[PDB]
């Protein structure tokens, strides 16, 4: 059961943007989105696929646990915090795309998809190159399909242990103060259009979760601070964070 708050618009025409926010109250199984045809738009999931990328390595021992060390391979890249080592942890933090691609590579494609169909994620279509698929291939997801799938998540009901899932729960940890938590994954998605960023979580609180999707334009990467802006100032609007 859905209902449509057009009110939203505003934060995102506040600075100049398009975009949706997706709420979804668990306690109450109630959604809220500013857009219902945008909600369920599909688009790239970019970094966003960490998250899905990050479970199924666990899971088959592609990566031992959140301290093994994936060292930089020397190749100097133009986001200097990719220069460096990385574990789970930080490579899920500053989204070392290059760290998930030898990941992806070590998956294969075979158990790729069969664990994306296994998850329900998106199109599961992993066509184009096993190493950039979530960046310029075939797969799609829409802000609706992120909640589907961070719920199941969340609940550890996905078809993995429930150690691979705690795991990329606690390398989702953004942000955690004495009124919520938030755990989440970025995403910006540039090399097919239309431009966007994206921010899939949820708010962790004492009584209740609420879980989170949204995506927006961006045509140029000064805007990206507004994945969160946005967000955030919904989430203050409908009272879920003081
Ligand atoms: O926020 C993310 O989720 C993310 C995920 C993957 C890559 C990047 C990225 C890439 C290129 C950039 C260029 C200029 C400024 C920032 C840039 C950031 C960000
Ligand atoms: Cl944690």
Redesign the pocket.
Known sequence: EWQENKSWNAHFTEHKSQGVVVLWNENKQQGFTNNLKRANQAFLP??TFKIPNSLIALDLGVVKDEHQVFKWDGQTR??ATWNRDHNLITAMKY?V?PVYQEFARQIGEARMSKMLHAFDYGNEDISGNVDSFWLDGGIRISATEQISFLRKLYHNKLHVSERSQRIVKQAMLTEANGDYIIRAK???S?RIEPKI??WVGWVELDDNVWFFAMNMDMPT?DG?GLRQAITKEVLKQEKIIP
């Open positions: 970019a970094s133009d986001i989204s795309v970025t995403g910006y540039t960023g994206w990467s990206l």
